[PDB]
Amino acid sequence: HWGYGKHNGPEHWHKDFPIAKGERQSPVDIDTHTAKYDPSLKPLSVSYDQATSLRILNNGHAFNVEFDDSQDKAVLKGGPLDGTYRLIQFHFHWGSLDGQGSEHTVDKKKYAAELHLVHWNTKYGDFGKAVQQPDGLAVLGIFLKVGSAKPGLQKVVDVLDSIKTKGKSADFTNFDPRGLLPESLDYWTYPGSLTTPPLLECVTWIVLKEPISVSSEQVLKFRKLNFNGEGEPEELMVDNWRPAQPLKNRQIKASFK
Numbered sequence: 001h002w003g004y005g006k007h008n009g010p011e012h013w014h015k016d017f018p019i020a021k022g023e024r025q026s027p028v029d030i031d032t033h034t035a036k037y038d039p040s041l042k043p044l045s046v047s048y049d050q051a052t053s054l055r056i057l058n059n060g061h062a063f064n065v066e067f068d069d070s071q072d073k074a075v076l077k078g079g080p081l082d083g084t085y086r087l088i089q090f091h092f093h094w095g096s097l098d099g100q101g102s103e104h105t106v107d108k109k110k111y112a113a114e115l116h117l118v119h120w121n122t123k124y125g126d127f128g129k130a131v132q133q134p135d136g137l138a139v140l141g142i143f144l145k146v147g148s149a150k151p152g153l154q155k156v157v158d159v160l161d162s163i164k165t166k167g168k169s170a171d172f173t174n175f176d177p178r179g180l181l182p183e184s185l186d187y188w189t190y191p192g193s194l195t196t197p198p199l200l201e202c203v204t205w206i207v208l209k210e211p212i213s214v215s216s217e218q219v220l221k222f223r224k225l226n227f228n229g230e231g232e233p234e235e236l237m238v239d240n241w242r243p244a245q246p247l248k249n250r251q252i253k254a255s256f257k
């Protein structure tokens with residue numbers, strides 16, 4: 001099955017998922033001089049005050065912090081979006097070294113990691129329906145660079161030892177995702193896809209310009225996770241990122257001058 005190794009990694013995915021070579025694949029390089037300011041874009045509205053986190057899961061590709069999305073509790077609206085998008089989960093992609101790990105790049109720069117806050121358009125009723133629609137999902141992407149610690153990340157870091165291997169989960173209630181945001185909500189936006197199989201072209205990407213800083217100790221703990229299940233030879237969960245894909249006939253728009 002698909003993964004991030006030499007024999008099952010991103011260059012192989014197209015054999016099982018031919019949309020990997022499609023017309024609106026993600027991630028992409030954000031060329032900051034070619035992205036055009038769109039004065040028509042609204043400010044993002046990130047309304048996470050009522051978020052209800054439930055569980056954290058190692059799924060063998062990353063770890064997901066899952067939320068109660070049975071009601072409009074934590075939602076993303078505004079910006080390029082029409083309607084209301086409910087937060088279902090967040091996860092990260094990261095590298096084996098600080099110089100790689102992000103999926104999007106900025107003028108070819110790779111960050112140490114990238115946070116994806118995944119939301120689905122409530123007009124489609126459930127996430128599985130939403131992923132079949134060109135406007136079904138909105139993923140808020142936030143870059144991580146290594147420097148000072150991010151206090152709001154530490155509760156995530158400290159539970160990772162309890163979910164070291166594929167298929168392990170742990171209770172993860174009362175986590176506030178507002179503690180993972182940078183100060184500014186300036187962003188780039190473009191139409192794209194899921195960055196893992198099935199690579200469905202259902203995502204409005206909203207990538208924040210301002211990275212958050214995390215400490216070396218925090219990211220080192222990400223890199224102690226395992227792709228493998230318990231009782232299997234250890235394969236460190238590192239470099240779980242897809243590289244930039246062709247932009248093709250797309251425009252990246254900036255919310256800011």
Ligand SMILES: NS(=O)(=O)c1ccc(CCN(Cc2ccc3ccccc3c2)C(=O)CN(CCC(=O)O)CCc2ccccc2)cc1
Binds near residue numbers: 195
């Ligand atoms: N990096 S990213 O771009 O942000 C990014 C990349 C990938 C994803 C996830 C895609 N994903 C796999 C999937 C999704 C759809 C598929 C459709 C057909 C065939 C295979 C598929 C595989 C799921 O969410 C699986 N969920 C089950 C795992 C769980 O519940 O833990 C379905 C949840 C669900 C909810 C309601 C109805 C049905 C399903 C998100 C973000």
Ligand SMILES: [Zn+2]
Binds near residue numbers: 091092093116195
């Ligand atoms: Zn992701």
